[PDB]
Amino acid sequence: MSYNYVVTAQKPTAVNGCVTGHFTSAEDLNLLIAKNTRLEIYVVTAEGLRPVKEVGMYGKIAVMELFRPKGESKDLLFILTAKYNACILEYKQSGESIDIITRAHGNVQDRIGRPSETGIIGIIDPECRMIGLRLYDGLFKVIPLDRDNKELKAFNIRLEELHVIDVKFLYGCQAPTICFVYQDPQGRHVKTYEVSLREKEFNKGPWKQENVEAEASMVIAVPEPFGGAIIIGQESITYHNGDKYLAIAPPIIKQSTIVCHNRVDPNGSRYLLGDMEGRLFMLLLEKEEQMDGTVTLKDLRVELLGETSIAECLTYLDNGVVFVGSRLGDSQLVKLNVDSNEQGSYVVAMETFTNLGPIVDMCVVDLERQGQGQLVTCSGAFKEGSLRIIRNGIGIHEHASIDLPGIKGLWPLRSDPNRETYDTLVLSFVGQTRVLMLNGEEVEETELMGFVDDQQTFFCGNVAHQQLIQITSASVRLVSQEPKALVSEWKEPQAKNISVASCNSSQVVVAVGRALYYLQIHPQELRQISHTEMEHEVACLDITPLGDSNGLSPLCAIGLWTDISARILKLPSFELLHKEMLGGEIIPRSILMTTFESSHYLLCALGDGALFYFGLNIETGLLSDRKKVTLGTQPTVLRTFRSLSTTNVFACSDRPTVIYSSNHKLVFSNVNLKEVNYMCPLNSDGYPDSLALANNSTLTIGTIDEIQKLHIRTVPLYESPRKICYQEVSQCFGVLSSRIEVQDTSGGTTALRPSASTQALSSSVSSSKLFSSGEEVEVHNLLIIDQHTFEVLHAHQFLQNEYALSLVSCKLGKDPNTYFIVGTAMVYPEEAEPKQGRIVVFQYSDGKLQTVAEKEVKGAVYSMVEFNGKLLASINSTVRLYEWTTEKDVRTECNHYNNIMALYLKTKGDFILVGDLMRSVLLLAYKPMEGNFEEIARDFNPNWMSAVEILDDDNFLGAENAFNLFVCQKDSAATTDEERQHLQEVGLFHLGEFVNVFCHGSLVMQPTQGSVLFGTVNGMIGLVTSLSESWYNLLLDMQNRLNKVIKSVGKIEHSFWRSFHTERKTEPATGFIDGDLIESFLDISRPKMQEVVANREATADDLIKVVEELTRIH
């Protein structure tokens, strides 16, 4: 029994595919970017991309095409999951509520059929007559496109050729006709088949099988004016037709393989081409005319336009704008100019979108000496390589810290109408008021004339027309910028005390307990206006001139005491509109209004910390959407702030939250602060652009961070990092990198660009002499990286043809020094595997990288961990436990041996080990008997491992090539000379993500138990946690209910998606709860929410809170 809960802490950032077309509106341009499982939907603008709709799916997208048949208005979408899920999508707006529909769907796999090289190829014919699929090796799948076929019934046709490389449909062919590059013992060839769907046959294509090159890897079909097939290999480009053939081998393209393409002009004149280098080519075909038939071709030449992130996906948009989909680096928006600049680049970067890319390796490191952890992932590859420092929450830059206990408010102020650098600030004190004027950065408490300092201030804002306002318990006083005394004054015509207050430039609304008054400010005098009484006692008010008026405010709204409500009203007339009745038993503490780009928002905060969101129109004055969140458990004070262009909302609480803007939505995320009571914007000539803060005691000021939950740094390495270690006693990261170099004319290698190891601040190479007995070679490095600066303190280069595989930072035995230990291997392309290698013990000093001790090994050092003052390495297949003499030298002790290829290791504290390559996992014990290994138990399934972590003394988490997670634990039954020997698979699961690395740590803190983060190839960062017996049984069930209520996108069963899947079996998943689906609850309509709960107890609006305490593990 192994109860587990996985969560997506960060969505996959790798673009896996993208397309253009009119999917939103027949007169709209759309960018359709598929991630792994996500599907971003954009519309193109003068700026670039307007986000529109982002949805997940239950599957890895592998095919994504837009198509528009006859008798259809706008383009429809066709998606095919890697688990062979076909489905046809459509975008459908009901005015303001946006929906993606399922027009067709089915499952298009067969029991028979090896999946082939290059994997899935899906293609639609130009006439929309069908959908052709090469799912399987040797067959071709047809989905005959009809008005019927809502379940996409598909017939297969036999293929004589069982190795296809690429296939397209050809324009201008009588029937539907395919075109492809196949392989056989003679080499590579081109062939066409006419696909008649009447007879379910393949007939014969419009032109005879010709011959393409022994590296051909792309068929590009060409549109109506031309017709034909452009075929791309290495070092050559061919154009094929009836008997027309054209070819060119431009030395430029030879250098690296053209990987992805794309048509720029509809008439198929200009095409874009991607490389492993990131080079952006322009394929141009020359128009030739005989003038009475159509148009032929004279030639076709290729020009190098510039440089992109290693393009996996490619799409031209409106005007020059090219979206570059990267997998190994940050995707980006790129402009094609007509003119070159410096270095001859017709390419100009517009925007660069953060891809956390191939996460090869990472670790959890504080770097702030708090309790929270930053994560530092080795991301990217080749020129795109980088470290990413991922920091959870928005943080504060502090400047001054004055110790004042019992502050009650603060508002922006100036003592000169000229400078907008607010040189003053007045705070509310414990029934008192003290002045704070600034000599600059000097905190000065004096008296100010016309301001009372023994009463308690309620408001103190910037009333324009030369005046300073001070509403307090009794009177609302007034000061000017000409005399500075009692310029005017207002008093309640009874001697009753004012309670609630709201004020802007030339407008004031107060409350005397149910009583209301509206004021005005002009030159020098305080003039009163209208008055109305109200149902109960006023708890809060708000007034502010919005985006439709200059200093004066149109409509209005409040919330009062007894009924516990939120009232919509008018201002001068004081009439009552459509209030929103609220539940609860505590007052509403704060109420506000805001404006961003497009929309107006009415927010109300409660006393027990909760918050409700509604939309008050500047015109209509009507309701909007309802939902409940938790913040802290204290009252929440709502303020407005200046940041960038989008100026936003700060929620003060015991758990401080900020409200930015995402796409049109309002962000809602944590703020790294002790506890925050009251807050305001600033801009003094001692602290500009600052935000002011107060709590129990102590003021703070200083600029605010970014937006979002996850902050991302990025330290561009320009090469490719393999693993990372954190020596904290040293205050620096050790990172293994790798650069590719080219054979040169003399006999050595050089470099292609300035990398991290080359332009390193200080370097050293290896001197060991232990070995004897069109060319690219990887060069490897340890890098020393300052944790504060992230500069390259040092870069050590390893030997020739030596790769550095593994890294540890530890103290070994009674050696007081901490070390860097690097496992390595010697690689040359004859041997299938290494039969050599090293183990180097590096020591970093004041600022010096010392080679302390080396050791030879007859095989690759795959991983290694600090066991117990002893070093535990895996050497190709022997797993050996080294110890550390006083000699300062690695001496052997024991070494197991029952492995195929020991790729990974993890240590459970005391004396326990794990992990293999193509035969699942093992479990070992070190015996302080004679320092001898004893194989405790092993998993007997045939998994192709990729990642291993020990969760606890029994739960072992493994990840594997087929994107599946599993969990092992030892059988606790009798007859333990056999049943002990096997450890059973107590939990399977389909993440749908290649897992590179696991480790312990959390991105938060100063309901569950444990915490294990993982990084994946697609850049997704996950979180595994272990569960308590009851919490599972509830969650698995409420997970089962959610399937019935949530309408799947491609109409895909969630339980199917989550099922364990290798080529040779499929099981439904046990012991695994994706909180992703659990988190799906909090974004449900209340009607479909009540459904989930029909049935120790079961509530309704109590689970809404349990799913809260979950979205707080990351």
């Binding site: 997998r327 190994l328 191939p358 090869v360 590859a381 393999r722 790798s738 990887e778 790769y803 595989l805 291997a825 690689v827 392309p829 041997e831 299938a832 595997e833 290494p834 690759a860 290829m901 790729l903 990729s946 090539n961 290649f994 590179n996 190839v1017 697609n1018």
Partner: peptide
């Protein structure tokens, strides 16, 4: 080889 495979399995095909 075994390693030319292992710096490509950490990246994807």
């Amino acid at each position: 080889q075994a390693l030319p495979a292992l710096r490509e399995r950490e990246l994807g095909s």
